[PDB]
Amino acid sequence: FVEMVDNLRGKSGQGYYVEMTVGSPPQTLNILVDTGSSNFAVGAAPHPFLHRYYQRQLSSTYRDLRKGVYVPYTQGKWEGELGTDLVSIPHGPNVTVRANIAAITESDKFFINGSNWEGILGLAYAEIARPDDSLEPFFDSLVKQTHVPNLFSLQLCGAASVGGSMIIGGIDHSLYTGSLWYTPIRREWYYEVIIVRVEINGQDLKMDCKEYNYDKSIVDSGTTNLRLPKKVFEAAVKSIKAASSTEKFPDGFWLGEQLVCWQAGTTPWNIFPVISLYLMGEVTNQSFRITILPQQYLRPVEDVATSQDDCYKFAISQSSTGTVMGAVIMEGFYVVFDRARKRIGFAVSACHVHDEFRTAAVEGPFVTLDMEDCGYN
Numbered sequence: 001f002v003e004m005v006d007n008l009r010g011k012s013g014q015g016y017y018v019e020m021t022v023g024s025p026p027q028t029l030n031i032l033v034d035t036g037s038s039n040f041a042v043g044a045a046p047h048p049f050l051h052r053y054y055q056r057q058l059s060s061t062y063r064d065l066r067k068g069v070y071v072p073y074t075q076g077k078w079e080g081e082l083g084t085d086l087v088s089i090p091h092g093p094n095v096t097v098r099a100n101i102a103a104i105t106e107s108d109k110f111f112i113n114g115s116n117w118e119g120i121l122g123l124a125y126a127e128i129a130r131p132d133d134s135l136e137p138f139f140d141s142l143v144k145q146t147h148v149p150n151l152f153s154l155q156l157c158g159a160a161s162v163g164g165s166m167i168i169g170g171i172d173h174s175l176y177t178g179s180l181w182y183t184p185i186r187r188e189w190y191y192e193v194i195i196v197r198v199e200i201n202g203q204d205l206k207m208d209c210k211e212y213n214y215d216k217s218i219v220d221s222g223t224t225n226l227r228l229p230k231k232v233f234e235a236a237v238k239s240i241k242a243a244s245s246t247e248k249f250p251d252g253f254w255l256g257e258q259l260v261c262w263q264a265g266t267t268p269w270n271i272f273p274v275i276s277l278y279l280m281g282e283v284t285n286q287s288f289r290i291t292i293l294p295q296q297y298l299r300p301v302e303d304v305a306t307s308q309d310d311c312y313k314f315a316i317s318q319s320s321t322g323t324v325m326g327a328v329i330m331e332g333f334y335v336v337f338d339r340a341r342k343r344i345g346f347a348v349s350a351c352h353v354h355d356e357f358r359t360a361a362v363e364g365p366f367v368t369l370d371m372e373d374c375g376y377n
């Protein structure tokens with residue numbers, strides 16, 4: 001799969017994109033890779049932030065579905081016109097497929113000024129496809145129309161400039177070390193999984209595990225942060241806050257309302273606790289755990305714009321939508337979306353940012369009881 005290694009690019013906090021082509025002759029676009037949604041959507045109009053956009057008039061293979069889509073979210077929205085056309089992935093499997101494309105024709109606070117992507121490849125399941133589940137997601141089309149196996153994997157590196165690999169239809173063994181550990185995909189809408197235990201340094205957190213998955217826990221390359229339900233956010237920060245009593249910070253920092261700086265090059269990582277999530281294992285009463293570092297949840301901020309030094313954002317934040325395992329979790333690990341076997345595998349990434357003393361890890365097996373009681377009904 002060396003065709004596919006390092007085919008992801010991007011910029012810090014603007015997401016990871018892959019090169020894709022649409023229509024005949026092919027139009028090249030950068031497309032944000034997103035495991036948190038299920039539409040293939042693309043700029044179709046000359047919005048001033050876009051570098052390029054889908055021009056259906058040039059495509060002899062485009063077919064109008066005569067149907068509009070409206071997708072609103074907390075702050076903004078995208079809207080578009082549905083269609084199908086021929087899609088391929090240059091640094092992907094050497095194949096072409098007829099897929100659905102939403103031609104984005106109006107949006108608010110969707111595109112990122114200064115980014116180099118022009119659309120979004122929602123890699124998740126039909127059940128959260130918009131406007132409804134009859135709109136076949138890109139990846140279903142791909143598997144259905146070719147001999148590509150039903151799974152992909154992400155190695156997200158990140159470092160302004162980021163890179164990674166999306167392996168379509170397989171696993172590249174050089175992208176990780178140690179062994180893959182798999183957690184079940186609870187239902188096929190988002191990539192839903194169940195967290196069964198949470199430890200900060202080692203001190204578990206002693207919460208009804210159900211809090212950890214309220215009302216869901218997902219895996220999302222479209223989110224930067226590790227996001228925790230309100231209640232789990234408290235006990236974690238309060239416990240992280242205790243772990244790092246070699247220093248004192250304003251309450252606003254923990255809230256992701258203000259950032260924090262140290263003389264250019266003098267951050268003490270050791271004051272900061274490792275974080276462990278245990279995930280439901282493949283077997284009754286069996287879990288494993290993933291461990292991330294401060295280097296994962298304290299992220300550099302580019303904008304030393306009215307500052308000089310090394311300022312970091314607390315990259316763990318609260319949620320009314322459940323746990324989101326975003327880039328903060330994913331950049332530690334190689335992640336296999338084993339769609340065919342309804343499961344997600346994690347392994348220590350070969351690219352991840354390690355230091356001298358501590359290392360991101362994936363360990364098992366452990367014994368955890370009542371794991372099914374951790375899901376939401």
Ligand SMILES: CC[C@@H](CC(=O)N[C@H]1[C@@H]2C[C@H]3C[C@@H](C2)C[C@@H]1C3)n1c(N)nc2cc(Cl)ccc21
Pocket residue numbers: 015032034035036037071072073078110111120220221222223
């Ligand atoms: C469910 C979690 C959220 C997180 C999120 O809001 N991501 C942002 C981010 C920046 C823009 C482009 C892309 C990644 C989706 C969305 C807007 N999310 C994801 N993963 N894909 C989304 C698509 C939409 Cl229309 C709204 C929220 C989305």
